[PDB]
């Protein structure tokens, strides 16, 4: 907006160029593409992952080896990552090297070679990576949560590529994906600590003559369905204790929804964590999940509130890890916590709770934004999504004006299954778990018993 020293304009080909902040000890820059696993459908499954793993290999004008070496000489602080709704190329470099880094980024984004050898390498390497990902509950559970929350479509389309599909990812599908999503009008070039004038110069020089391929628009809105799923107990290792896991959520809100700040505050007020929580004050030991769960039940080794928020939908809920013996109590424990946020006249949210959660929310946002790379990514994604950068001041103000009732009203809306997003989701809960299915009991009956979710549309 204003204090940010934020400026935004477009090139003739539609590529937006965003800059912010003032000169500093060094700069950051990145290319943001509106792509991700949610747009793969069934035909392009796994293409986002492979393209991101192919980032910065050989291009039409730069040999592989020269690419790698020049990136090292630049400091090596660059990366390509992708998720459900994003695909980004980012780096921080010394001020005098912005142009060279933008050139390299535009080369891998516009003229990647993707030789048979490079592709075969990333594919082989992806199989191993997928095998390791499936051993990490911290990664598997959220993946199962999304898949069931949208019945495997868009936001629930696998973020982890099915192993058996990797071998059939061909150059053809990779080119199809690039031709649909890698277009100037679907891209943003952002910079932190680089004068806007200089950014337009460099962008026009390396991305200016880039032309669209005018592909078929294939972006579907997310339709929350709710659902259940359960995978077998994890193998019992050596000294590590055996744990069952469960995640329960309801459709949440889009990141630009008006009540998003109230929702984030709710998530902070519930807080939670691992029964260990190593660190000094300010970690959140006074949040409800610590107080009403961790400190009360230890057969519970972890309990935390999550809030996945995207462009058109979100998932909000609670995660719980416990000893197999306690599984039968898991659902109820979680249901009570949700209930107590709005439906318990004797556990209403207090001024203190809300005031603390508010300051902790402002705190993590502002403190995180101290990093140039985070300022960069936040700006790039915001512009990519709604073509503007909400200024910090506005963000803080909206958080400070929140009052207890706001949080209670939002808690009720979410947990009651009364969210109305563009995709018109059901008010059904999403319950995903790892362990013996029987051990969790009648999950739907316990949730209804607490008036959670919505039965009648």
């Amino acid at each position: 907006a204003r204090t940010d020293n934020f400026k935004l304009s477009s090139l003739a080909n539609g590529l937006k160029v965003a800059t912010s902040n003032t000169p500093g000890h060094f700069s950051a820059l990145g290319l943001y593409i509106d792509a991700g696993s949610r747009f793969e459908g069934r035909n392009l499954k796994g293409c986002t992952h492979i393209l991101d793993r192919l980032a910065f290999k050989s291009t039409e004008h730069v040999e592989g080896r020269a690419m790698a070496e020049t990136l090292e000489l630049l400091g090596g602080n660059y990366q390509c990552t992708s998720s459900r709704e994003n695909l980004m190329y980012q780096a921080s470099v010394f001020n005098q090297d912005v142009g060279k880094m933008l050139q390299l980024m535009s080369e891998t984004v516009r003229f990647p070679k993707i030789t048979e050898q490079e592709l075969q390498e990333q594919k082989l390497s992806a199989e191993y990576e997928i095998d390791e990902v499936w051993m990490k509950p911290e990664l598997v559970l959220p993946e199962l949560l999304h898949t069931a929350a949208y019945s495997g479509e868009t936001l629930g389309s696998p973020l982890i590529c099915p192993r058996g599909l990797i071998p059939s990812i061909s150059k053809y599908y990779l080119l199809d994906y690039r031709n649909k999503f890698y277009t100037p009008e679907n891209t943003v070039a952002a910079f932190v600590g680089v004068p806007h004038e200089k950014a337009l110069e460099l962008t026009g020089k390396y991305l200016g003559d880039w032309q669209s391929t005018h592909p078929p628009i294939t972006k579907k809105v997310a339709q929350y369905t709710g659902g259940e799923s359960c995978i077998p107990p994890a193998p019992v290792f050596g000294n590590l204790p055996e744990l069952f896991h469960i995640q329960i959520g309801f459709e949440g809100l889009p990141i630009d929804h008006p009540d998003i700040y109230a929702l984030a505050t709710l998530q902070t007020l519930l807080g939670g964590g691992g029964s260990f929580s190593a660190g000094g004050p300010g970690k959140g030991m006074y949040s409800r999940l610590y107080t009403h769960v961790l400190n009360q039940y230890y057969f519970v080794e972890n309990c935390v509130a999550f809030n996945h928020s995207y462009s058109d939908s979100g998932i909000f809920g609670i995660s719980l890890s416990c000893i197999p013996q306690a599984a039968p109590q898991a659902v109820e424990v979680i249901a009570q916590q949700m209930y107590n946020t709005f439906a318990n006249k004797d556990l209403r949210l207090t001024e203190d709770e809300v005031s603390r959660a508010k300051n902790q929310l402002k705190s993590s946002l502002l403190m995180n934004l101290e990093s140039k790379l985070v300022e960069l990514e936040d700006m790039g994604r915001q512009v990519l999504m709604h073509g503007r950068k909400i200024p910090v001041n506005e963000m803080i103000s909206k958080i400070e004006d929140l009052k207890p009732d706001d949080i209670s009203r939002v808690a009720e809306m979410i947990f009651t299954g009364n969210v109305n997003n563009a995709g018109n989701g059901k008010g059904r809960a999403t319950v995903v778990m790892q362990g013996d299915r029987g051990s969790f009991g009648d999950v739907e009956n316990v949730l209804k018993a607490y008036g959670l979710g919505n039965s009648s549309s």
Binding site: P281, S363, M367
Partner: protein, 439 residues
């Protein structure tokens, strides 16, 4: 533009760096103390104090401190090293003064309840048991013990279990009285911070701190320079799947004129992992040799540790206890150091190393916390803060020649100390190492 400085009447230094467009900051109090200020019976006190400083002050009970920080969204943390004691906070700019207050309160007016002192003895033991499962940490504590034989720097931070069970409230108050002097501490801040106001609050909350009676400027010599003792410690342990070796030679201190040259040479040798490679597009002859014919080890890592008055520089090696002849990987490492001493290094690898180094030192100075960390540590151990631009210059001017010069001075006819943990039967002697190296 840059780091503003001010000294309080009791000696305390206030160093700050304003960060435009921010509404949050980090403040930290750095004390030249740590475990190197303890003695054999004293050993472990500084760390012990760090646990207690969060259990209550003469102004706030434990739960009162936590609850206060959480309500305004701040963060409170601390750590003890062989050289320093550090406590710091992160908060919204409005809460900076509340932060300085609490920091001074926790550092100088801690209750040190006798009941607390006993309940904590157990937490520290648990802590020590866990460190014993970290083979790299174990190897390095032993290396410090034999390299700085019978010296302050040679002692661990946790201290022996014996002392963890015998430290008394008296030991604690004594350590505090002896070491917490204004001339031995730095209050560093960065972010949305007003240097002038921060100095006032400093005086208000830290002014009561005793000046040493024989004040010495922050970067001036403590007393007799630590002396590097050559030595070896083979710790046979046939149950370990991996064997861990650390080889070191006298390094460089924080203020050494050749400090950056030492780091640049470390970067030229770099690291390697049997599964991951070097993290570089082109491996050194060492990395290639390590990976050849079945592999000579599981990984190696170059390291450089610095202190105000001394430093350790060397290699940390991890091998498979059943598959590797440690002697083979050690030969290759020496060969690589000799390659540097003989001048056989390209301009390309020298520029690669300088670029890596510049990046590690500067691109990492991102948030206020990392910046406070650089400001505080530099001023408390050196008396000044080289700015990011000055550091860039110091690295940028390094030449192939400076490196060859430096290796021939530090890695020729100099003593080496070594520690090995695991299957020690394949590990070569320290005189073996010096023979091959100087050869």
């Amino acid at each position: 533009p840059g780091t503003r400085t001010s000294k309080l009447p009791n000696g305390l230094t206030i160093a700050t760096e304003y960060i435009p467009n921010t509404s949050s900051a980090t403040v930290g109090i750095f004390v030249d103390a740590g475990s190197r200020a303890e003695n054999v019976k004293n050993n472990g006190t500084a760390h012990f104090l760090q646990h207690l400083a969060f259990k209550g002050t003469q102004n706030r009970p434990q739960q009162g401190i936590e609850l206060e920080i959480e309500n305004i969204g701040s963060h409170l943390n601390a750590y003890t090293s062989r050289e320093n004691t550090v406590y710091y906070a992160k908060s919204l700019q409005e809460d900076i003064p509340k932060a300085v207050d609490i920091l001074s309160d926790i550092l100088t007016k801690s209750v040190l309840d006798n009941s607390a002192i006993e309940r904590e003895r157990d937490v520290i033991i648990r802590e020590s048991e866990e460190v014993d499962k970290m083979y790299d940490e174990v190897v390095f504590d032993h290396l410090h013990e034999i390299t700085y034989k019978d010296q302050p720097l040679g002692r661990t931070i946790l201290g022996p279990i014996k002392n963890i069970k015998s430290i008394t409230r008296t030991d604690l108050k004594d350590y505090i009285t002896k070491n917490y002097k204004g001339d031995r501490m730095v209050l560093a801040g960065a972010g949305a911070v007003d240097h002038e106001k921060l100095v006032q609050y400093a005086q208000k909350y830290f002014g009561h701190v005793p000046k040493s009676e024989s004040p010495v400027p922050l970067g001036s010599p403590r007393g007799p320079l630590p002396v590097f003792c050559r030595g070896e410690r083979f710790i046979k342990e046939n149950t370990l799947p991996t064997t861990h070796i650390a080889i070191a030679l006298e390094g460089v201190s924080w203020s050494a004129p050749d400090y950056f040259v030492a780091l640049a040479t470390q970067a030229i040798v770099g690291n390697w992992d049997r599964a991951i490679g070097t993290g570089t597009n082109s491996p050194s002859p060492l990395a290639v040799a390590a990976s050849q014919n079945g592999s000579l080890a599981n990984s190696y890592m170059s390291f450089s540790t610095s202190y105000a008055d001394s430093g350790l520089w060397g290699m940390y090696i991890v091998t498979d206890s059943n598959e590797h002849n440690v002697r083979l990987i050690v030969n290759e490492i020496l060969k690589e150091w000799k390659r540097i001493k003989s001048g056989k290094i390209s301009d390309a690898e020298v520029n690669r190393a300088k670029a890596q180094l510049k990046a590690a030192l500067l691109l990492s100075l991102d948030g206020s916390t990392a910046i406070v960390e650089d400001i505080g540590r530099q001023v408390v151990t050196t008396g000044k803060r080289l700015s990011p631009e000055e550091v860039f210059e110091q690295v940028d001017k390094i030449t192939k020649d400076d490196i060859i010069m430096w290796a021939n001075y530090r890695l020729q006819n100099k003593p080496v100390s070594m520690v090995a943990l695991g299957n020690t039967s394949t590990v070569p002697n320290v005189s073996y190492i010096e023979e091959k190296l100087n050869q």
